[PDB]
Each structure stands twice: as structure tokens, then as C-alpha cells.
Write a protein that binds this DNA or RNA. Structure first.
Ligand SMILES: [Mg+2]
Ligand SMILES: [Mg+2]
Ligand SMILES: [Mg+2]
Ligand SMILES: [Mg+2]
Ligand SMILES: [Mg+2]
Ligand SMILES: [Mg+2]
Ligand SMILES: [Mg+2]
Ligand SMILES: [Mg+2]
Ligand SMILES: [Mg+2]
Ligand SMILES: [Mg+2]
Ligand SMILES: [Mg+2]
Ligand SMILES: [Mg+2]
Ligand SMILES: [Mg+2]
Lengths: 176, 199, 247, 190, 109, 138
RNA sequence: CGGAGCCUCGGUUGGCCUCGGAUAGCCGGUCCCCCGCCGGGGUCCGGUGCGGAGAGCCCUUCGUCCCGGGAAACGGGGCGGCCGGAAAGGGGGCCGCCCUCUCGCCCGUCACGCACCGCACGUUCGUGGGGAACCUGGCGCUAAACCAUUCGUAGACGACC
RNA sequence: UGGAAUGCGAGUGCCUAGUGGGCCACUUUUGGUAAGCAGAACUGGCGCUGCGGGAUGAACCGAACGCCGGGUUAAGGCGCC
């Protein structure tokens, strides 16, 4: 999977085809983190082929639809349980992200895992994302934003829009 | 029609890439006070880079070899000539259009010089990163005219301080004349305020 | 492979442009550095190599075996007639190079110095310095010369003096005198230029310039020996007798 | 990670009246004035409170390498206040086995002549920085006393003579000779 | 009694790294360095003005030494306000980095 | 020494982006370079917005960090930012730049014919002040 | 130094005549206060995405003819003395006069100017650089180098003294 | 009711040049420490082939070629060359 742009969160359900052995197979639901529904269905078949004895030709996806954030305006703390593949072995993580939505937090998770550990999106496997109150947070980079009277300046405003005034007289001010 | 560019606080290659394109595009660029050019990274890496550059010479005849220039203006000419197709006639015309000075001469001291913010040290580098002065690097590697340029620039900074004092006195005269005469020129003043020039 | 028995190299690369010298008179490449504590004086002189003889003197050095003994040593006689000062020149200090600012000659310049400015003195009409010497007996020319000296008071950093040798007293065949700049190292620029203007159109002997038991530098062109082989010039090892194409 | 805020205050005594122009600080009082320019460290200096009773140093959005740079400014300011109030009197001893090290002081604390070290006829003329005064005290045989305000200059002048009196091409574990720093204290007590 | 043409510097031809298509010319109009701002000059007429040795005829006056190669601004190029032009006769590469005149009278205002 | 601080309640001017040239309020701080951002009266919907586009100003109206748009609007109307913003020289030179951008050609001709005499009068008065200062000095 | 045509070479289509410098900090003043040969220090006061803004400043050319208002009366223009400039040096400032104006710029009346009848290289820096020759006048000018010969401090020949 | 889907006009007879030194590449694999080494299996290229890219380049990626104009991409890139 290519983590293209931002991720989306799909509630994908599926089951096996009806057989003369069992008439109605049970339904299996997952929360797939994917850009679009085609790769959501593909990654759903990947995880179902990992977990159960079920493949695409021996089964079916009953419904694949995007399910949205119930509070996109509130800023929350998502704890994501990671299972990634290193260059030497496979490892597990538990990493916190302060963000609005689940899809945005998982997008930031893919970007930051590829940042620090060079972990590719085909190696990264997400198993659980849970919204967490501010008391149960563990990471100090997330807990440092937990303040009612938070107050900080913007210390070094490195200016952009550099190549429209290419040849100017005055030196740029950067104290704001 | 001449880009008189300042050299203080400007990055070497980031300035040279901006200069060489405008030189190829038919603009007379004069980059001045090139000992104020500062190169990113600490001083010892840039010094050993230029010392490896000095060691790279022709074995059988170094007079035919690479001419390693020691002046900061000629180091800037070296990097712009590296950023030009100087084997071609348009590159030779570009090198003819380019004119680079150590210090700042009396043909160019009494001119308002330009500053490129896309190649400046405080813009493009983090403040915790180290930088190396090209003039100090050149005088340490064998350029003989740092103190002479320092005394001549001290003299012209005194002269430019006197000129800027005269300009401040003229600006005070202009503002006090406007404060006196604003009643009878309020008809000319209000029409620029409705068009957005003095608001 | 490598050289079996390592050997030091024949010759020096510090002297490798072994061409015939473009200049005949020995040019001073570096004058001594000035300081305002010392008074004004000349820092160079221009003599002529006369000959060679012995010397006999006492040796006064403690610790040696040769202490209080009568040694002989080779000496050079250099005939050094007093030179005539016929001009001055100031030097401004630029970031490109130490540039000559303004050269001011003298009024009465001798025919010995007049010989140097001509390649053929016989066919010449001897008409040099004629429009320049008219500036010394008029009102406007003295004002322009005073403005020139007053500009040299301000902007010149190094003041060199122009002196030529006195060739008529010498027993040489030639009559063309050698000219030379000598850097005056001394006090301030104003006192230096005043002393040079005082010493203008004057004789300078050798007792004013040098003294007894002074260590000095000798500049000059080597005795010419012509086109020579590598054995004669670089002093390499000769090949043995059995070589076909030369040894 | 980027820590949002780190700070540490310096409570100055009432004998001292500090001020600052930009980021360069000056400290004046009984002994003298001492300046230090902070243009390499890139922090916020708040001179808050009436009668300027404390100096605060902020660091906003800096990771561990610039968080390490916060307490060092406090330490340099406290050393400068200690140098202005009390001073720095470094006492140091001349240890020798056989040859008595002859130490004398020329130009009232500017130069130190060191003689008779391991029987060497070479003498060391070690020059202090101006501001540091070397002397020989009373009621002690082998003693050098360095007085001054700036701890940098006084301890650098101590290190100069400590590295001047060294034994070369020998076993320094057996040849325990030289002038070495013994006591690091102040000129007057408090 | 003034300038009635915008300043534009002829940079080069439509080219790859090791090929050039000299029928399409790349033009750098001064003052405009954005794709939203280069939409004004689309369709304007442009010409490289040069003077030669021999005299040529001039419409509305005496014959002079000046000559032109007329053209037409086709479409934008890049993202930094470069633009394209198709001319009837191809430009010489003597004019690399020289002034041509883009005009305003093919107007859309 | 810093004067402006990213605090819960600060009004900031947005430089670029979709809502360019608009006032907005900081409701909560999300990340190092992203903030929870709302403008009730200046028509900016509740959103996340980085600190690059917003330019923080000297206006702070008080509301809690999780307070909603009704309370932000009531604090905005109580603080009355829209009048003091137009009274500030910041927005006055912004609207001066807007008038210079929307300047017509006939308006520019009137500007030129005003500037000509307006500079001639300044030059005459500066010359009279120069000769008066010379007379007072001599 | 002070006129007309005529070849060649090209680009060009208004100038900005200047503080130093910082970036977790700048700019401009009065100076009640204090030192120096107007500068500096503290304090005070206004701005600080810069508006004592290069997101800017100056000039603006279609022209002339009459009258009235705003602006000017201390200004536009027309020959000699005195100063400032050297890193590769500025068509800068001050005193006047024997002569000419309320014309120059801003608002209004009043007409005129090949109105070349829709059609492109138009509009300047341009007395632009270089070479040929004619013009009118004034003030100034009366050369070296090389070959030849000689020397031998030099040298294959050249070159050099 | 031309007894699955899709696609394509097929079958057949003479005469016959050149070739019979090959090489490289994902995967499998023999000998060898290994080799730009020697020898194999499938398939594609070079040989026989230009073009854009890999700075350079018989084999790599893309893509195969009559002569041109407008547009658009692939592989690669978008500080300057
Ligand atoms: Mg050896
Ligand atoms: Mg033989
Ligand atoms: Mg031993
Ligand atoms: Mg023309
Ligand atoms: Mg064969
Ligand atoms: Mg075979
Ligand atoms: Mg093989
Ligand atoms: Mg084939
Ligand atoms: Mg092919
Ligand atoms: Mg390669
Ligand atoms: Mg492939
Ligand atoms: Mg095509
Ligand atoms: Mg490329």
C-alpha cells in the first residue's frame, strides 16, 4: 500500500461464500486505514488471509464503506499499536499522537515511522487505534501540550516567500 | 540596469546559483564585498576542502594546471564559472558580463546595493549551525589584503556615516516642512490617502 | 618498481625558471619593513663589483679553537660612488597591489641619468625633460607641484626615492648610469617626504646608508655561462664510458 | 523532542546592579565590571523585578543539545557575580623533589619568571592576561597566589604555568615535579 | 511618447537535455513569475528587433536598418512565469539573452 | 525579549491560504506547528491551521481552551476586535495597499498630478529651511 | 578647443547620488541629565510582516496661443573665484553680476497645429564607439625606435649590456 | 438450438540464399574461494536497434523508427550547467 496524501478509515465487513457444509458464515469487521476503497479491500483481504482461513475467491466482502470521525473538531490523543518489520526482525510499538481525527493520526503515524525508522507502509501493520484521555497518556511530547494556560512565542520566524522579492534593499526582519 | 549585489551574510553557492542565471539572462551583475560571504558548515571542513583543492594540481606542469585563486572575489568568480557553460561563447559572454570585486570600489560605494534574501545566512541556515568567513579563509590560506580592505572599509564606513547623518538631517527638514505646510497641501494630501499611499 | 638506493634530488625547484634574466640591474624584491621609531634613512644602495683580495683580522669568538687567531678570508671590493637623487615616487596601498601613485622628478637632472631614457643617445636630439623642467620657474607650475606633494602627504603610504649612480667617476666603458628606487623607511609620511625633498638634487654617500660590521643582502645577476648541458647545469651523475648515445 | 520551555533564575545580591543591552550582560559592583557577550547561545534574557533582583533565561522549542545550554548561562552569571563580589584567589603549590623551583614575578603580576626546574638552564617567562595578578604570599614557603575577577582568565593563567612546569621524555609518575593548583577559592570570604 | 511594449528577455528554445526544438521559443517576460499572472500575455504578438547593415523598407516612413521577426505568444511554460512563442522564421541564437518586444495591442480587455 | 505569545484566545491575522487576509482566534494548540483555529465574525470555519500562515497580533480575548463557537463569538463581540482592528495602523496600511492595487488609470493620473505639485511644494519649503539653517549657522 | 553631409559596429527604449548592523531583536527624535571633539551613554516617546515601506522613492514629454484662481516673490536660466574626491579618484556645493520673467508647475475658459481617411519595426541613452576625407577660426608642436657599426658584464641564431 | 469464453481469412506445393564462433539479464541451477570464470533450464534483449532517461555506456528502465505541425505522457527529473 502507498500512503498517498492522507489516509481514510473504512469499516469493511466480509464473510465466506455459502457452502453446503455451513449455510451462513459469520461476518468479520475491520477498520482499514487506506487511501481509497480498492486498496482498502485489498488490505482487508491481506489481514483476513493472515488471521482466518479465508481468501478472496473463497469469500466475499459484504460492505466496504468509509466511516468518519464523530468529533473532528476536538483535538484528541490516539494511542496506536504498531507492528512493523525492521531490517533485522519484526518489532512492536505503542505510540501516541495528538491529532483531531483517527485517519489523520494514522497518516501522521505512517509519516513519522517512515521518518524515524524508514519503515515502509507495506511493512507497517496497524492493529488498534484508541482515543485516550489526557491522564492516561505516556509520551512526554504528547503530555507537554496538556496545559490549560499554554503559552509560547514563535521564536525564529524563518521567512518564506523568498523568490518574489529576489533583489531587495532591506534585510528581512524575523522577530514577530 | 546593473544588479549591484551585497556580499555580507550571503551564502557562496546559493548566491552563485542566483547570480549565474541572471548573468545568462542578459543582466549585468556586480557582486561586491565578497569577503563577507560565509559558507555553511564549520571552518575546518571548508579549510580542508580548499586545501584538498590546492593539492589537486597537475603533476607534469602545474602552470598548465588548475589555477587556484586565493582572493575571495576570484573564489566567487571560480564558483560562478563552475555554474556556467564557460566552454561556450555564451558562457564566455557571461563571464565578461560578470564583474566581482574585493571590498567595494569608489565606482560602486556610492550606490544602493541589493540583497538577495534567498541566499542569506539568517534565512537559509539554522542559527545553531556553524559558518565560515570566506575572507578569513582566504587570508588564512594566503590572501594578502585583509587588513588593507579592513582599513579602507573603515574609512568608507566613516564617510557613509557622515552621508547618512546628512540624509537624516534632510529627512528631518522634509518632515518639519510637511508639518508646517500640511494645511495648504491637505488637498493634495487627502487625494493620496483615498488612493492608498500615505495611510 | 621503486628506486633501489634512494638519493637526494639534483637541483632545487625553488629556482626552476632558469631563463636569462629580463632585467640586468638587480631589482629589490622586498625592502625592509618600516617603523616610526626609527629615523628616516635609505635602505638600499647600488654599487659595482670591482675585484677580490685577501684580508687579515683577529677572530673574537669565545669557545672556538680559532679564538684570537689571524685568519685570512676572501673579500669583495665593491666600488660605491655617491649617487645623485633625481626624483621621488609615492605608493598607495590597494587590495589589488601596492600601486605607484605619482612620480615627481627633479629640475636639474644630469646627463648620466639622461642616458638611461634613450636606447640610442647618438641619433637622439637630447630633448627629454624639456617640457617638465619648465614647471620649476613659473607661478602655476610651483603651485601644481605643491598640490602634488600635498596629495602625496595625504594618500601615499610608501615613499621610494629615485637615485642614479655617478658613472663619470667610474673607470667603466659605459656612460649610461643606472637608476634605482630605494624605499625610505623612517618616521611619518610627512617627515619622510620632507626629508626626501631636502635630499632632492643631492649626493648620497655610503656612510649615510650603511655602516661598519652590518649584515647586508646582495642582489645581482649571475655571471652568464651560456647554453650548457644537464651535467654542467644540474650537476647530475655522468653515465659511464660504454654508453652509445652520449654520457 | 522539542521541549516547549526551559528556564532557570539567578537571584542576584543587593550589592550588585546588573543590566544588559541586547544579549550581552554586564556585572558591576565593589571590585569592578565584567562583561560577557552571549551572541553564540541564542536565548531570551529577562531582567525582571524592581531593583533587578533576579535574571531569568528562557529557551523555547529546543531539544537536548540546546536544553544543555540553559544551566551554563546561569553558571557563568553566578561565576561573574562571585568574581565581582568576592573574586578568585587561586592558591597553588610548587612541588619539587630535588631542585627548588625559583619563582619570581615581574611587572606587578604580569609576568612570571620560572627558574631551576629539574636543573634546566632555560627559564620560563609566562605572561598572564591583564586582570590577573600573580604574587607570593606570606607564611608559606612554596606558594603562588593568582588574584582576579574573571574565572576564565585566572584559571587560564593557572593552566599556563601548570603546563609550563612539565617534565618531558621521562616518567612523570616518578618525577612528581611542577606547579599545581591546590586551592580554588575567593579573595574575601562571605 | 513612451514605451508601448513590455520587457521580455529571450532565454532559449524549447529543449530537452540533449535535444532542442528550435521552432518553439521560450520567453521570459519581466515582472511576471507566476502561472496565474502569465495568463494576461497569452496571445500577444512579439518580435525580436535588430538592426543590420543593408537598408530595408519600413511601412510608414523612410527605409532604415532595423529588422524584425514577428510572432505570437502561444502558451505558458513552467511555473515561474516563462512562456512560449511560435515565430514564422526561427530566431537566431545570436539573440540568446537579448531583449525582444512583447506587445499589448493583441488585447483581450 | 518576546512580546507576542501563542496563547489561548489570541487573535491573529492570516497571511496566505484559503482564508487569506482575515482575523481569526486561537482556540486550542494542537501540535508544534498546528493549532485549533476559529473565526466567528470574520467567516473562518472551525479548523486546524498551521502557524506559518497566521501572524499573531496584540489582541487577546478570554475564553477556555475547549469553548465552542458561541462563546468565541460572545467574547469577540465583548472585546470588539473589528473596530480596534480598523483603528490600528496595521489594517489601515493593508487597506491602503488594497486601494493602491485597485487604483484605476484615471485615478493614477490624478495621483501623478497631485504628487507633482505636492513634491514641488516640499522641495521649495526644504530649500527655504536649508537657507534658513545656513543663515542661523552663519 | 569652438559646423554639414556620409560608411561601419551593435545592443538599448526614464533614473534611484551609498549608513553600519542585528535576527531570542530593530528604526527615528527631543534631549529635562552627563562626558568628548556635532558624537556617545542612560532615561523618555511613537512604530516594529516594517509605511523615515525597493510590497518602495523621484521625474513624467502632445505642443502653443488669451484670461482668472491656487503656488512663487528668497525661484528658473545666462561668466569668474573658494572648497570637498585616490581602493580603479565627482559634468558636486557656495558667493555674485552688466542681462530675461511672473512663461515653467497645479485647477478652470479659449481655439489652433497634415484630422495623412483601422494596419509593423513608433518613442530615448544619441553631438553613441571606430575609419576616411572635406569646413571655418584661435592657441600650441618641432620626435623616437629598429637595421648598420661598435662593445663582450652577453651569446647556437635571435636576444641582452 | 453450429452445442464453453475471446480473438483471427485458412489450407497446401515447389525453388531457395544466409546461418551452423555467440553474448548479456529477473528466476532455478553444475563445477569453482571467487571471477567481467567455465557449463545448463524458461523467457526477453544485444547481435540486427535507432530514440528519452542511467553524466559517460552493445545488454539497465521506458519505448521500438517514413517526412512534419498542435497537444499529452512513460522512464527520469524540476538550485545552476
Ligand atoms: Mg625508497
Ligand atoms: Mg656501445
Ligand atoms: Mg627513558
Ligand atoms: Mg533603435
Ligand atoms: Mg564460422
Ligand atoms: Mg559451436
Ligand atoms: Mg557462461
Ligand atoms: Mg529481431
Ligand atoms: Mg532496442
Ligand atoms: Mg551512472
Ligand atoms: Mg521490467
Ligand atoms: Mg511533438
Ligand atoms: Mg537533470
Amino acid at each position: 500500500m502507498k500512503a498517498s496524501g492522507t489516509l481514510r478509515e473504512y469499516k469493511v465487513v466480509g464473510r465466506c461464500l455459502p457452502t453446503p457444509k455451513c449455510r451462513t458464515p459469520p461476518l468479520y469487521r475491520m477498520r482499514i486505514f487506506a487511501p481509497n476503497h480498492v486498496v482498502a479491500k485489498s488490505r482487508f483481504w491481506y489481514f483476513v488471509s493472515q488471521l482466518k482461513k479465508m481468501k478472496k475467491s473463497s469469500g466475499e466482502i459484504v460492505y466496504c464503506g468509509q466511516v468518519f470521525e464523530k468529533s473532528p473538531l476536538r483535538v484528541k490523543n490516539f494511542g496506536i499499536w504498531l507492528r512493523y518489520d525492521s531490517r533485522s526482525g519484526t518489532h512492536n510499538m505503542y505510540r501516541e499522537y495528538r491529532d483531531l481525527t483517527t485517519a489523520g493520526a494514522v497518516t501522521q503515524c505512517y509519516r513519522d515511522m517512515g521518518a524515524r525508522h524508514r519503515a515502509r507502509a507495506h511493512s507497517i501493520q496497524i492493529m488498534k487505534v484508541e482515543e485516550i484521555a489526557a491522564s492516561k497518556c505516556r509520551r512526554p511530547a504528547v503530555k507537554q501540550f496538556h496545559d490549560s494556560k499554554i503559552k509560547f512565542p514563535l521564536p525564529h520566524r524563518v521567512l518564506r516567500r523568498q523568490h518574489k522579492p529576489r533583489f531587495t534593499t532591506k534585510r528581512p526582519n524575523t522577530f514577530f | 540596469q546593473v544588479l549591484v549585489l551585497d556580499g555580507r551574510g550571503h551564502l557562496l553557492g546559493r548566491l552563485a546559483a542566483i547570480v549565474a542565471k541572471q548573468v545568462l539572462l542578459g543582466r549585468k551583475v556586480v557582486v561586491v564585498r565578497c569577503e563577507g560571504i560565509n559558507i555553511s558548515g564549520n571552518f575546518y571542513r571548508n579549510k580542508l576542502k580548499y586545501l584538498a583543492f590546492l593539492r589537486k594540481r597537475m603533476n607534469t606542469n602545474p602552470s598548465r594546471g588548475p589555477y587556484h585563486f586565493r582572493a575571495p572575489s576570484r573564489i566567487f568568480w571560480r564558483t560562478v564559472r563552475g555554474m556556467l557553460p564557460h566552454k561556450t561563447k555564451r558562457g564566455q559572454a557571461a563571464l565578461d558580463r560578470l564583474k566581482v570585486f574585493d571590498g567595494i570600489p569608489p565606482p560602486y560605494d556610492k550606490k544602493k546595493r541589493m540583497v538577495v534574501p534567498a541566499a542569506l545566512k539568517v534565512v537559509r541556515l539554522k542559527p545553531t549551525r556553524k559558518f565560515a568567513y570566506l575572507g578569513r579563509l582566504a587570508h588564512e590560506v594566503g590572501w594578502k589584503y585583509q587588513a588593507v580592505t579592513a582599513t579602507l572599509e573603515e574609512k568608507r564606513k566613516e564617510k557613509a556615516k557622515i552621508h547618512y547623518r546628512k540624509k537624516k538631517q534632510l529627512m528631518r527638514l522634509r518632515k518639519q516642512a510637511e508639518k508646517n505646510v500640511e494645511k495648504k497641501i491637505s488637498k493634495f494630501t487627502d487625494v493620496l490617502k483615498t488612493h492608498g499611499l500615505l495611510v | 618498481s621503486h628506486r633501489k638506493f634512494s638519493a637526494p634530488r639534483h637541483g632545487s625547484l625553488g629556482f626552476l625558471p632558469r631563463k636569462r634574466s629580463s632585467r640586468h640591474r638587480g631589482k629589490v624584491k622586498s625592502f625592509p619593513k618600516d617603523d616610526p621609531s626609527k629615523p628616516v634613512h635609505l635602505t638600499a644602495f647600488l654599487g659595482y663589483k670591482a675585484g677580490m683580495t685577501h684580508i687579515v683580522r683577529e677572530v673574537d669568538r669565545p669557545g672556538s679553537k680559532v679564538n684570537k687567531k689571524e685568519v685570512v678570508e676572501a673579500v669583495t671590493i665593491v666600488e660605491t660612488p655617491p649617487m645623485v637623487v633625481v626624483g621621488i615616487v609615492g605608493y598607495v596601498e590597494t587590495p589589488r597591489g601596492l600601486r605607484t601613485f605619482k612620480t615627481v622628478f627633479a629640475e636639474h637632472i644630469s646627463d648620466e641619468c639622461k642616458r638611461r631614457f634613450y636606447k640610442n643617445w647618438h641619433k637622439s636630439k637630447k630633448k627629454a625633460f624639456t617640457k617638465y623642467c619648465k614647471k620649476w620657474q613659473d607661478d602655476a607650475g610651483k603651485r601644481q607641484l605643491d598640490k602634488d606633494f600635498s596629495s602625496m602627504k595625504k594618500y601615499c603610504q610608501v615613499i621610494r626615492v629615485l637615485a642614479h649612480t655617478q658613472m663619470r667617476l667610474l673607470p667603466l666603458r659605459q656612460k649610461k648610469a643606472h637608476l634605482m628606487e630605494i624605499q625610505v623607511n623612517g618616521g611619518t609620511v610627512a617627515e619622510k617626504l620632507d626629508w626626501a625633498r631636502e635630499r632632492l638634487e643631492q649626493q648620497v654617500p655610503v656612510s649615510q646608508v650603511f655602516g661598519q660590521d652590518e649584515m647586508i643582502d646582495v642582489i645581482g645577476v649571475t655571471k652568464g655561462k651560456g647554453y650548457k648541458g644537464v651535467t654542467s647545469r644540474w650537476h647530475t651523475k655522468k653515465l659511464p664510458r660504454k654508453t652509445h648515445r652520449g654520457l | 523532542m522539542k521541549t516547549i520551555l526551559s528556564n532557570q533564575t539567578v537571584d542576584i545580591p543587593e550589592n550588585v546592579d546588573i543590566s544588559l543591552k541586547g544579549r550581552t550582560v554586564i556585572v558591576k559592583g565593589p571590585r569592578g565590571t565584567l562583561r560577557r557577550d552571549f551572541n553564540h547561545i541564542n536565548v531570551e534574557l529577562s531582567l525582571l523585578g524592581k531593583k533587578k533582583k533576579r535574571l531569568r533565561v528562557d529557551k523555547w522549542w529546543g531539544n537536548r543539545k540546546e536544553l544543555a545550554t540553559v544551566r551554563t548561562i546561569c553558571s557563568h552569571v553566578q561565576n561573574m557575580i562571585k568574581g565581582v563580589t568576592l573574586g578568585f584567589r587561586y592558591k597553588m603549590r610548587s612541588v619539587y623533589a630535588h631542585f627548588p623551583i625559583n619563582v619570581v614575578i615581574q611587572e606587578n603580576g604580569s609576568l612570571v619568571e620560572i627558574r631551576n626546574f629539574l636543573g634546566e638552564k632555560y627559564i620560563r617567562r609566562v605572561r598572564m592576561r591583564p586582570g590577573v595578578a600573580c604574587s607570593v604570599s606570606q607564611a608559606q614557603k612554596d606558594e603562588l597566589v593568582l588574584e582576579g575577577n574573571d574565572i576564565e582568565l585566572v584559571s587560564n593563567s593557572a593552566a599556563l604555568i601548570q603546563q609550563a612546569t612539565t617534565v618531558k621524555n621521562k616518567d612523570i609518575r616518578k618525577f612528581l615535579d611542577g606547579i599545581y593548583v591546590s586551592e580554588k577559592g575567593t579573595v574575601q570570604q562571605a | 511618447s513612451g514605451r508601448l511594449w513590455c520587457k521580455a528577455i529571450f532565454a532559449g528554445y524549447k529543449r530537452g537535455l540533449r535535444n532542442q526544438r528550435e521552432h518553439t521559443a521560450l520567453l521570459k517576460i519581466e515582472g511576471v513569475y507566476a502561472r496565474d499572472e502569465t495568463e494576461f500575455y497569452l496571445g500577444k504578438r512579439c518580435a525580436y528587433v535588430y538592426k543590420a547593415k543593408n537598408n530595408t523598407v519600413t511601412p510608414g516612413g523612410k527605409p532604415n536598418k532595423t529588422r524584425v521577426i514577428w510572432g505570437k505568444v502561444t502558451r505558458a511554460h513552467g511555473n515561474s512565469g516563462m512562456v512560449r512563442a511560435k515565430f514564422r522564421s526561427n530566431l537566431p541564437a545570436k539573440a540568446i539573452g537579448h531583449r525582444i518586444r512583447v506587445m499589448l495591442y493583441p488585447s483581450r480587455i | 525579549v518576546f512580546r507576542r505569545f501563542v496563547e489561548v484566545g489570541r487573535v491573529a491575522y492570516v497571511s496566505f491560504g484559503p482564508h487569506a487576509g482575515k482575523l481569526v482566534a486561537i482556540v486550542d494548540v494542537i501540535d508544534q506547528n498546528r493549532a485549533l483555529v476559529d473565526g466567528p465574525c470574520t467567516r473562518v470555519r472551525r479548523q486546524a491551521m498551521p502557524f506559518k500562515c497566521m501572524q499573531l497580533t496584540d489582541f487577546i480575548l478570554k475564553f477556555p481552551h475547549s469553548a465552542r463557537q458561541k462563546y468565541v463569538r460572545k467574547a469577540w463581540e465583548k472585546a470588539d476586535i473589528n473596530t480596534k482592528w480598523a483603528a490600528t495602523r496595521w489594517a489601515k496600511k493593508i487597506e491602503a495597499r488594497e486601494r493602491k492595487a485597485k487604483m484605476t488609470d484615471f485615478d493614477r493620473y490624478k495621483v501623478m498630478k497631485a504628487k507633482k505639485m505636492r513634491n514641488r511644494i516640499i522641495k521649495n519649503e526644504v530649500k527655504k529651511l536649508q537657507r534658513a539653517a545656513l543663515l542661523k549657522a552663519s
